[PDB]
Amino acid sequence: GAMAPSYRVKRMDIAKNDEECVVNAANPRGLPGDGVCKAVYKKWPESFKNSATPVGTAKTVMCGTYPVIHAVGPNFSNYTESEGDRELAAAYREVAKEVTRLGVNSVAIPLLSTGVYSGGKDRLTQSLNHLFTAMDSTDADVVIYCRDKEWEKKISEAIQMRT
Ligand SMILES: Cc1ccc(N)nc1
């Protein structure tokens, strides 16, 4: 575990992370994809061997000794708000199980279902609150990665609010 488990947020490419493992915002088929998934495929292509997994689950594949946790959030274009909310919560619970099993002291994590799976809605708060519900009982240092300057400020505010 980390000495004093924390949450942080950085605005940069998660492929440049300084953590002991990474969470990919994966598709269910283990395809290279777009956004985070494309950056992760470029950086860790070996981790896409047999990475296909259903919605609401996470599957870890090693790139050398570096763990890539493929977490499949729902595409809100296809799911109802209710069913999508349940699957998005479940994906993060499976990430917390993997992070714990791996025994890492730190993890880099994107906000699942906030980009091309958002069904064109702002899901910062919904996705971040499911991340906290899952990760709060873990003792890894969590570093959240985002692209957008306004999102960085809002995520930083949400973290600071609860400290
Ligand atoms: C949110 C986001 C988008 C791309 C990337 N490489 N990391 C994080």
Short mmCIF file of N, CA and C and ligand atoms in Angstrom, two decimals:
data_model
loop_
_atom_site.label_atom_id
_atom_site.label_comp_id
_atom_site.label_asym_id
_atom_site.label_seq_id
_atom_site.Cartn_x
_atom_site.Cartn_y
_atom_site.Cartn_z
N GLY A 1 0.86 -1.26 0.00
CA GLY A 1 0.00 0.00 0.00
C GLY A 1 0.86 1.26 0.00
N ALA A 2 0.30 2.40 -0.43
CA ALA A 2 0.94 3.72 -0.27
C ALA A 2 0.89 4.09 1.21
N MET A 3 1.90 4.84 1.69
CA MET A 3 2.04 5.31 3.10
C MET A 3 0.80 6.11 3.51
N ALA A 4 0.35 6.98 2.62
CA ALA A 4 -0.80 7.89 2.86
C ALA A 4 -1.63 7.97 1.58
N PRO A 5 -2.42 6.91 1.31
CA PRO A 5 -3.11 6.81 0.02
C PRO A 5 -3.81 8.12 -0.37
N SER A 6 -3.66 8.57 -1.62
CA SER A 6 -4.13 9.88 -2.10
C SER A 6 -4.85 9.73 -3.43
N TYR A 7 -5.58 10.77 -3.80
CA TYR A 7 -6.06 11.04 -5.17
C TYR A 7 -5.39 12.28 -5.71
N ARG A 8 -4.97 12.22 -6.96
CA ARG A 8 -4.43 13.36 -7.70
C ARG A 8 -5.05 13.38 -9.09
N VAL A 9 -4.93 14.51 -9.77
CA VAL A 9 -5.38 14.61 -11.17
C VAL A 9 -4.28 15.29 -11.97
N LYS A 10 -4.01 14.76 -13.17
CA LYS A 10 -3.07 15.36 -14.13
C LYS A 10 -3.74 15.50 -15.50
N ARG A 11 -3.44 16.60 -16.19
CA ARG A 11 -3.91 16.86 -17.55
C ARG A 11 -2.78 16.55 -18.52
N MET A 12 -2.75 15.32 -19.01
CA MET A 12 -1.72 14.84 -19.96
C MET A 12 -2.14 13.46 -20.46
N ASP A 13 -1.38 12.97 -21.42
CA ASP A 13 -1.53 11.63 -22.03
C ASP A 13 -1.20 10.56 -20.99
N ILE A 14 -2.16 9.68 -20.69
CA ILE A 14 -2.01 8.55 -19.71
C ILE A 14 -0.91 7.58 -20.17
N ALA A 15 -0.57 7.54 -21.47
CA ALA A 15 0.61 6.77 -21.94
C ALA A 15 1.96 7.25 -21.37
N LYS A 16 2.02 8.45 -20.78
CA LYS A 16 3.24 9.04 -20.15
C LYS A 16 3.16 8.94 -18.62
N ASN A 17 2.24 8.13 -18.07
CA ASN A 17 2.01 8.09 -16.61
C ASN A 17 3.27 7.68 -15.83
N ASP A 18 3.31 8.06 -14.56
CA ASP A 18 4.38 7.75 -13.59
C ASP A 18 3.87 6.82 -12.50
N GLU A 19 2.97 5.91 -12.84
CA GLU A 19 2.36 4.98 -11.86
C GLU A 19 2.76 3.53 -12.17
N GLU A 20 2.44 2.61 -11.25
CA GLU A 20 2.89 1.20 -11.33
C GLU A 20 2.02 0.35 -12.25
N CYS A 21 0.86 0.86 -12.67
CA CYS A 21 0.00 0.21 -13.65
C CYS A 21 -0.98 1.23 -14.23
N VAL A 22 -1.60 0.88 -15.32
CA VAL A 22 -2.53 1.75 -16.08
C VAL A 22 -3.85 1.04 -16.29
N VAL A 23 -4.93 1.81 -16.26
CA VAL A 23 -6.29 1.37 -16.66
C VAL A 23 -6.56 1.91 -18.05
N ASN A 24 -6.85 1.01 -18.97
CA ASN A 24 -7.28 1.36 -20.34
C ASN A 24 -8.80 1.53 -20.36
N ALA A 25 -9.30 2.58 -20.98
CA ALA A 25 -10.74 2.71 -21.30
C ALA A 25 -10.99 1.91 -22.58
N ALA A 26 -11.14 0.61 -22.45
CA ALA A 26 -11.13 -0.40 -23.51
C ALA A 26 -12.50 -0.52 -24.17
N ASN A 27 -12.50 -1.14 -25.35
CA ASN A 27 -13.73 -1.66 -25.96
C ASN A 27 -13.82 -3.13 -25.64
N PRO A 28 -15.02 -3.71 -25.74
CA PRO A 28 -15.21 -5.12 -25.39
C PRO A 28 -14.46 -6.14 -26.27
N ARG A 29 -14.00 -5.73 -27.44
CA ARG A 29 -13.40 -6.64 -28.44
C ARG A 29 -11.89 -6.63 -28.43
N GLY A 30 -11.27 -5.83 -27.55
CA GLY A 30 -9.80 -5.78 -27.53
C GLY A 30 -9.24 -5.16 -28.77
N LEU A 31 -9.97 -4.24 -29.43
CA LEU A 31 -9.51 -3.53 -30.64
C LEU A 31 -8.75 -2.28 -30.27
N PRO A 32 -7.82 -1.80 -31.13
CA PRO A 32 -7.10 -0.56 -30.86
C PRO A 32 -7.95 0.66 -30.53
N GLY A 33 -9.11 0.84 -31.14
CA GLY A 33 -10.05 1.89 -30.68
C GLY A 33 -9.58 3.30 -30.98
N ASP A 34 -10.05 4.29 -30.21
CA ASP A 34 -9.72 5.73 -30.33
C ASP A 34 -9.42 6.32 -28.95
N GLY A 35 -8.93 7.56 -28.91
CA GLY A 35 -8.76 8.28 -27.63
C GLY A 35 -7.74 7.58 -26.74
N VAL A 36 -8.04 7.43 -25.44
CA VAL A 36 -7.17 6.71 -24.45
C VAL A 36 -6.77 5.36 -25.06
N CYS A 37 -7.74 4.59 -25.55
CA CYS A 37 -7.50 3.20 -26.04
C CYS A 37 -6.40 3.14 -27.13
N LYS A 38 -6.44 4.09 -28.07
CA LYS A 38 -5.45 4.20 -29.17
C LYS A 38 -4.06 4.51 -28.60
N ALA A 39 -3.99 5.41 -27.62
CA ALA A 39 -2.70 5.84 -26.98
C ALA A 39 -2.12 4.62 -26.25
N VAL A 40 -3.00 3.88 -25.58
CA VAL A 40 -2.59 2.67 -24.81
C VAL A 40 -2.13 1.60 -25.80
N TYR A 41 -2.81 1.46 -26.95
CA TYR A 41 -2.40 0.46 -27.96
C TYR A 41 -1.01 0.77 -28.53
N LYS A 42 -0.73 2.06 -28.77
CA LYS A 42 0.58 2.54 -29.28
C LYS A 42 1.68 2.21 -28.26
N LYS A 43 1.41 2.46 -26.98
CA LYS A 43 2.43 2.37 -25.90
C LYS A 43 2.66 0.92 -25.46
N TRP A 44 1.60 0.15 -25.33
CA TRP A 44 1.59 -1.21 -24.75
C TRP A 44 0.87 -2.19 -25.68
N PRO A 45 1.24 -2.33 -26.97
CA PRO A 45 0.46 -3.19 -27.88
C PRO A 45 0.42 -4.66 -27.47
N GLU A 46 1.47 -5.13 -26.79
CA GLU A 46 1.54 -6.54 -26.32
C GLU A 46 0.39 -6.82 -25.34
N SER A 47 -0.12 -5.79 -24.63
CA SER A 47 -1.18 -5.98 -23.64
C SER A 47 -2.53 -6.24 -24.30
N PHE A 48 -2.63 -6.22 -25.62
CA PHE A 48 -3.94 -6.47 -26.25
C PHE A 48 -4.09 -7.93 -26.69
N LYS A 49 -3.13 -8.78 -26.37
CA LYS A 49 -3.32 -10.25 -26.56
C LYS A 49 -4.42 -10.79 -25.65
N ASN A 50 -5.55 -11.24 -26.21
CA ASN A 50 -6.68 -11.82 -25.43
C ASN A 50 -7.17 -10.82 -24.36
N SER A 51 -7.27 -9.55 -24.73
CA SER A 51 -7.81 -8.52 -23.80
C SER A 51 -9.34 -8.35 -23.93
N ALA A 52 -10.00 -8.94 -24.92
CA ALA A 52 -11.47 -8.84 -25.08
C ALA A 52 -12.17 -9.30 -23.80
N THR A 53 -13.18 -8.56 -23.35
CA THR A 53 -13.91 -8.82 -22.09
C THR A 53 -15.24 -8.09 -22.17
N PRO A 54 -16.29 -8.56 -21.47
CA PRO A 54 -17.60 -7.93 -21.60
C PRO A 54 -17.71 -6.55 -20.96
N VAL A 55 -18.78 -5.85 -21.29
CA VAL A 55 -19.07 -4.55 -20.64
C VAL A 55 -19.19 -4.78 -19.14
N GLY A 56 -18.70 -3.81 -18.33
CA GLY A 56 -18.85 -3.88 -16.86
C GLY A 56 -17.76 -4.70 -16.19
N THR A 57 -16.78 -5.19 -16.95
CA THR A 57 -15.65 -6.01 -16.44
C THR A 57 -14.31 -5.39 -16.75
N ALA A 58 -13.28 -5.93 -16.10
CA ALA A 58 -11.89 -5.54 -16.31
C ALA A 58 -11.06 -6.81 -16.44
N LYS A 59 -10.12 -6.77 -17.34
CA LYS A 59 -9.21 -7.89 -17.61
C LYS A 59 -7.80 -7.33 -17.69
N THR A 60 -6.87 -7.87 -16.88
CA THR A 60 -5.46 -7.41 -16.86
C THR A 60 -4.62 -8.29 -17.79
N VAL A 61 -3.79 -7.65 -18.60
CA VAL A 61 -2.75 -8.29 -19.45
C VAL A 61 -1.45 -7.55 -19.23
N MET A 62 -0.38 -8.30 -19.01
CA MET A 62 0.97 -7.75 -18.73
C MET A 62 1.66 -7.35 -20.04
N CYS A 63 2.29 -6.17 -20.07
CA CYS A 63 3.21 -5.75 -21.14
C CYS A 63 4.60 -5.79 -20.52
N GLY A 64 5.35 -6.86 -20.75
CA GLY A 64 6.51 -7.13 -19.89
C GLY A 64 6.09 -7.46 -18.50
N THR A 65 6.47 -6.67 -17.50
CA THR A 65 5.98 -6.78 -16.13
C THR A 65 5.04 -5.61 -15.78
N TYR A 66 4.68 -4.79 -16.75
CA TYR A 66 3.83 -3.59 -16.48
C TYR A 66 2.37 -3.96 -16.72
N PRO A 67 1.48 -3.92 -15.69
CA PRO A 67 0.09 -4.35 -15.86
C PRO A 67 -0.83 -3.32 -16.53
N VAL A 68 -1.52 -3.76 -17.59
CA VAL A 68 -2.55 -2.94 -18.28
C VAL A 68 -3.90 -3.54 -17.90
N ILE A 69 -4.75 -2.77 -17.21
CA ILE A 69 -6.06 -3.25 -16.74
C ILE A 69 -7.08 -2.74 -17.78
N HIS A 70 -7.58 -3.60 -18.64
CA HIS A 70 -8.59 -3.20 -19.66
C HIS A 70 -9.96 -3.16 -19.02
N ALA A 71 -10.49 -1.96 -18.79
CA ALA A 71 -11.81 -1.75 -18.12
C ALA A 71 -12.83 -1.28 -19.17
N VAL A 72 -13.90 -2.03 -19.30
CA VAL A 72 -14.90 -1.77 -20.38
C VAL A 72 -16.15 -1.08 -19.81
N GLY A 73 -16.20 0.24 -19.93
CA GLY A 73 -17.39 1.00 -19.56
C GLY A 73 -18.43 0.88 -20.66
N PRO A 74 -19.70 1.08 -20.32
CA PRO A 74 -20.78 1.06 -21.30
C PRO A 74 -20.73 2.23 -22.29
N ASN A 75 -21.20 1.96 -23.51
CA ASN A 75 -21.42 3.04 -24.50
C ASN A 75 -22.86 3.53 -24.30
N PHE A 76 -23.05 4.72 -23.76
CA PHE A 76 -24.38 5.28 -23.41
C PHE A 76 -25.19 5.55 -24.69
N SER A 77 -24.60 5.40 -25.87
CA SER A 77 -25.43 5.40 -27.12
C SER A 77 -26.33 4.16 -27.14
N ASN A 78 -25.89 3.04 -26.58
CA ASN A 78 -26.59 1.74 -26.69
C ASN A 78 -27.38 1.38 -25.45
N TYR A 79 -26.92 1.80 -24.27
CA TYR A 79 -27.53 1.47 -22.96
C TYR A 79 -28.55 2.58 -22.60
N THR A 80 -29.60 2.20 -21.90
CA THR A 80 -30.46 3.13 -21.14
C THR A 80 -29.61 3.85 -20.09
N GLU A 81 -30.01 5.04 -19.64
CA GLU A 81 -29.31 5.73 -18.50
C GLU A 81 -29.19 4.81 -17.29
N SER A 82 -30.24 4.08 -16.93
CA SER A 82 -30.26 3.20 -15.75
C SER A 82 -29.26 2.05 -15.93
N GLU A 83 -29.33 1.32 -17.04
CA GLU A 83 -28.48 0.13 -17.23
C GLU A 83 -27.02 0.57 -17.41
N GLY A 84 -26.82 1.67 -18.09
CA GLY A 84 -25.48 2.22 -18.30
C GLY A 84 -24.86 2.59 -16.97
N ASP A 85 -25.64 3.26 -16.12
CA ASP A 85 -25.13 3.66 -14.79
C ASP A 85 -24.67 2.41 -14.02
N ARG A 86 -25.44 1.30 -14.05
CA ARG A 86 -25.10 0.06 -13.34
C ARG A 86 -23.80 -0.53 -13.91
N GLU A 87 -23.65 -0.56 -15.23
CA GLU A 87 -22.45 -1.18 -15.84
C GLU A 87 -21.23 -0.30 -15.55
N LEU A 88 -21.38 1.02 -15.53
CA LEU A 88 -20.23 1.94 -15.33
C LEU A 88 -19.72 1.76 -13.88
N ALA A 89 -20.64 1.70 -12.92
CA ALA A 89 -20.29 1.36 -11.51
C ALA A 89 -19.58 0.02 -11.44
N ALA A 90 -20.07 -1.02 -12.12
CA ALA A 90 -19.49 -2.37 -12.07
C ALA A 90 -18.06 -2.35 -12.64
N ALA A 91 -17.82 -1.68 -13.78
CA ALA A 91 -16.47 -1.67 -14.39
C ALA A 91 -15.49 -1.16 -13.32
N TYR A 92 -15.82 -0.06 -12.62
CA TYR A 92 -14.88 0.47 -11.62
C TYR A 92 -14.70 -0.50 -10.45
N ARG A 93 -15.76 -1.19 -9.99
CA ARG A 93 -15.57 -2.21 -8.92
C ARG A 93 -14.57 -3.28 -9.38
N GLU A 94 -14.62 -3.73 -10.65
CA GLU A 94 -13.66 -4.74 -11.15
C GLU A 94 -12.27 -4.13 -11.22
N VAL A 95 -12.10 -2.84 -11.54
CA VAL A 95 -10.76 -2.22 -11.53
C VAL A 95 -10.20 -2.28 -10.10
N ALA A 96 -11.00 -1.97 -9.09
CA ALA A 96 -10.50 -2.00 -7.69
C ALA A 96 -10.05 -3.41 -7.31
N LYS A 97 -10.77 -4.46 -7.73
CA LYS A 97 -10.36 -5.87 -7.48
C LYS A 97 -9.01 -6.15 -8.14
N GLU A 98 -8.81 -5.71 -9.39
CA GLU A 98 -7.54 -5.97 -10.09
C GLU A 98 -6.39 -5.22 -9.43
N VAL A 99 -6.57 -3.94 -9.11
CA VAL A 99 -5.54 -3.10 -8.48
C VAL A 99 -5.12 -3.81 -7.18
N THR A 100 -6.10 -4.28 -6.42
CA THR A 100 -5.80 -4.97 -5.12
C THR A 100 -5.02 -6.26 -5.37
N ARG A 101 -5.48 -7.09 -6.29
CA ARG A 101 -4.86 -8.39 -6.62
C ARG A 101 -3.40 -8.19 -7.06
N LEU A 102 -3.08 -7.13 -7.81
CA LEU A 102 -1.76 -6.91 -8.39
C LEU A 102 -0.76 -6.47 -7.30
N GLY A 103 -1.26 -5.88 -6.22
CA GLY A 103 -0.43 -5.41 -5.08
C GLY A 103 0.34 -4.16 -5.41
N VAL A 104 -0.08 -3.40 -6.44
CA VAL A 104 0.60 -2.14 -6.82
C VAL A 104 0.38 -1.08 -5.73
N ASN A 105 1.27 -0.11 -5.66
CA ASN A 105 1.14 1.04 -4.75
C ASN A 105 0.56 2.27 -5.47
N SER A 106 0.36 2.22 -6.78
CA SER A 106 -0.15 3.40 -7.55
C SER A 106 -0.80 2.88 -8.85
N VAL A 107 -1.77 3.63 -9.36
CA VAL A 107 -2.51 3.29 -10.61
C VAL A 107 -2.87 4.59 -11.32
N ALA A 108 -2.71 4.63 -12.64
CA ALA A 108 -3.16 5.70 -13.55
C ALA A 108 -4.53 5.29 -14.10
N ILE A 109 -5.53 6.16 -13.99
CA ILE A 109 -6.93 5.81 -14.37
C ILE A 109 -7.60 6.97 -15.11
N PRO A 110 -8.23 6.69 -16.26
CA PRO A 110 -9.04 7.68 -16.96
C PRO A 110 -10.49 7.62 -16.46
N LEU A 111 -11.31 8.65 -16.79
CA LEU A 111 -12.74 8.60 -16.42
C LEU A 111 -13.49 7.80 -17.49
N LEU A 112 -13.92 6.60 -17.14
CA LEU A 112 -14.63 5.69 -18.07
C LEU A 112 -15.94 6.32 -18.56
N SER A 113 -16.26 6.03 -19.84
CA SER A 113 -17.52 6.42 -20.52
C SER A 113 -17.71 7.94 -20.57
N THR A 114 -16.65 8.75 -20.57
CA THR A 114 -16.76 10.24 -20.64
C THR A 114 -16.43 10.78 -22.03
N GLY A 115 -15.90 9.97 -22.93
CA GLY A 115 -15.49 10.41 -24.29
C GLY A 115 -16.48 9.90 -25.33
N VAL A 116 -16.02 9.08 -26.28
CA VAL A 116 -16.93 8.62 -27.37
C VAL A 116 -18.01 7.64 -26.85
N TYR A 117 -17.94 7.14 -25.61
CA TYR A 117 -19.00 6.30 -25.00
C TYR A 117 -20.00 7.10 -24.15
N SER A 118 -19.89 8.43 -24.10
CA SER A 118 -20.72 9.29 -23.22
C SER A 118 -22.15 9.48 -23.76
N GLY A 119 -22.42 9.04 -24.99
CA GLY A 119 -23.73 9.31 -25.65
C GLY A 119 -24.00 10.82 -25.73
N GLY A 120 -22.94 11.61 -25.90
CA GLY A 120 -22.96 13.08 -26.08
C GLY A 120 -23.34 13.87 -24.83
N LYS A 121 -23.18 13.30 -23.62
CA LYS A 121 -23.53 13.97 -22.34
C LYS A 121 -22.27 14.14 -21.49
N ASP A 122 -22.26 15.18 -20.68
CA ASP A 122 -21.19 15.46 -19.69
C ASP A 122 -21.41 14.48 -18.55
N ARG A 123 -20.47 13.53 -18.37
CA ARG A 123 -20.57 12.50 -17.31
C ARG A 123 -19.37 12.59 -16.36
N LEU A 124 -18.73 13.76 -16.27
CA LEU A 124 -17.58 13.91 -15.32
C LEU A 124 -18.01 13.45 -13.94
N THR A 125 -19.04 14.06 -13.33
CA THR A 125 -19.42 13.80 -11.94
C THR A 125 -19.86 12.34 -11.78
N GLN A 126 -20.68 11.85 -12.71
CA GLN A 126 -21.23 10.45 -12.63
C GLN A 126 -20.05 9.46 -12.62
N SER A 127 -19.12 9.66 -13.54
CA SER A 127 -18.00 8.70 -13.73
C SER A 127 -17.04 8.83 -12.54
N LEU A 128 -16.70 10.06 -12.16
CA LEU A 128 -15.77 10.29 -11.01
C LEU A 128 -16.36 9.71 -9.72
N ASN A 129 -17.66 9.88 -9.46
CA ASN A 129 -18.26 9.37 -8.20
C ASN A 129 -18.23 7.85 -8.20
N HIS A 130 -18.41 7.19 -9.36
CA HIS A 130 -18.29 5.71 -9.37
C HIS A 130 -16.82 5.29 -9.16
N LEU A 131 -15.89 6.05 -9.65
CA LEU A 131 -14.44 5.80 -9.43
C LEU A 131 -14.19 5.86 -7.92
N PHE A 132 -14.63 6.92 -7.27
CA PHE A 132 -14.41 7.05 -5.81
C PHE A 132 -15.08 5.89 -5.09
N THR A 133 -16.34 5.54 -5.40
CA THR A 133 -17.05 4.47 -4.67
C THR A 133 -16.21 3.18 -4.68
N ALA A 134 -15.61 2.87 -5.83
CA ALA A 134 -14.79 1.66 -6.00
C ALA A 134 -13.43 1.78 -5.32
N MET A 135 -12.73 2.89 -5.52
CA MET A 135 -11.30 2.99 -5.17
C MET A 135 -11.12 3.44 -3.71
N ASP A 136 -12.14 3.95 -3.05
CA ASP A 136 -11.93 4.54 -1.69
C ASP A 136 -11.43 3.48 -0.71
N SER A 137 -11.82 2.22 -0.88
CA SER A 137 -11.42 1.15 0.06
C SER A 137 -10.07 0.55 -0.34
N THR A 138 -9.46 1.02 -1.44
CA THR A 138 -8.10 0.53 -1.81
C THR A 138 -7.02 1.46 -1.22
N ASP A 139 -5.78 0.98 -1.07
CA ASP A 139 -4.70 1.81 -0.49
C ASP A 139 -3.67 2.18 -1.56
N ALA A 140 -4.01 2.05 -2.85
CA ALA A 140 -3.12 2.57 -3.91
C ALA A 140 -3.22 4.10 -4.04
N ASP A 141 -2.13 4.78 -4.36
CA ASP A 141 -2.18 6.18 -4.84
C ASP A 141 -2.89 6.15 -6.21
N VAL A 142 -3.97 6.91 -6.35
CA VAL A 142 -4.73 6.97 -7.63
C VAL A 142 -4.40 8.28 -8.30
N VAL A 143 -4.02 8.22 -9.56
CA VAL A 143 -3.76 9.43 -10.38
C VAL A 143 -4.71 9.39 -11.57
N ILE A 144 -5.64 10.33 -11.57
CA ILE A 144 -6.67 10.46 -12.62
C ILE A 144 -6.08 11.28 -13.75
N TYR A 145 -6.24 10.84 -14.99
CA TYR A 145 -5.72 11.53 -16.20
C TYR A 145 -6.90 12.07 -17.00
N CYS A 146 -6.78 13.31 -17.45
CA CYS A 146 -7.79 13.99 -18.30
C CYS A 146 -7.05 14.83 -19.35
N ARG A 147 -7.80 15.36 -20.33
CA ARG A 147 -7.31 16.15 -21.49
C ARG A 147 -7.69 17.63 -21.32
N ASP A 148 -8.90 17.89 -20.85
CA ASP A 148 -9.57 19.21 -20.91
C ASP A 148 -9.22 20.05 -19.67
N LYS A 149 -8.89 21.33 -19.87
CA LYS A 149 -8.49 22.26 -18.78
C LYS A 149 -9.63 22.49 -17.77
N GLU A 150 -10.88 22.64 -18.22
CA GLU A 150 -12.03 22.81 -17.30
C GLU A 150 -12.29 21.53 -16.48
N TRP A 151 -12.17 20.36 -17.13
CA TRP A 151 -12.30 19.06 -16.42
C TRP A 151 -11.22 18.95 -15.33
N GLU A 152 -9.99 19.34 -15.62
CA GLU A 152 -8.89 19.26 -14.63
C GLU A 152 -9.31 20.04 -13.37
N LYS A 153 -9.85 21.24 -13.55
CA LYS A 153 -10.20 22.13 -12.42
C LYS A 153 -11.34 21.45 -11.63
N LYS A 154 -12.36 20.92 -12.32
CA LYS A 154 -13.53 20.29 -11.68
C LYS A 154 -13.14 19.02 -10.93
N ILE A 155 -12.29 18.18 -11.53
CA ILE A 155 -11.81 16.95 -10.84
C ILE A 155 -10.99 17.33 -9.60
N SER A 156 -10.10 18.32 -9.73
CA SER A 156 -9.24 18.79 -8.63
C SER A 156 -10.12 19.31 -7.48
N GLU A 157 -11.15 20.08 -7.83
CA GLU A 157 -12.11 20.61 -6.82
C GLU A 157 -12.82 19.47 -6.10
N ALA A 158 -13.29 18.45 -6.82
CA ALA A 158 -14.01 17.31 -6.22
C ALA A 158 -13.07 16.57 -5.27
N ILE A 159 -11.81 16.37 -5.66
CA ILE A 159 -10.84 15.66 -4.78
C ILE A 159 -10.68 16.50 -3.50
N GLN A 160 -10.42 17.80 -3.66
CA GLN A 160 -10.05 18.71 -2.52
C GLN A 160 -11.24 18.83 -1.56
N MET A 161 -12.48 18.82 -2.09
CA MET A 161 -13.74 18.93 -1.31
C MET A 161 -13.82 17.90 -0.19
N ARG A 162 -13.32 16.68 -0.42
CA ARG A 162 -13.54 15.52 0.49
C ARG A 162 -12.36 15.34 1.46
N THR A 163 -11.31 16.17 1.37
CA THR A 163 -10.07 16.09 2.20
C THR A 163 -10.18 16.99 3.44
C1 LIG B 1 -8.62 11.57 -21.38
C2 LIG B 1 -7.38 11.08 -22.10
C3 LIG B 1 -7.29 11.10 -23.48
C4 LIG B 1 -6.17 10.63 -24.13
C5 LIG B 1 -5.11 10.12 -23.35
N1 LIG B 1 -4.02 9.59 -23.93
N2 LIG B 1 -5.17 10.10 -22.00
C6 LIG B 1 -6.28 10.57 -21.41
#
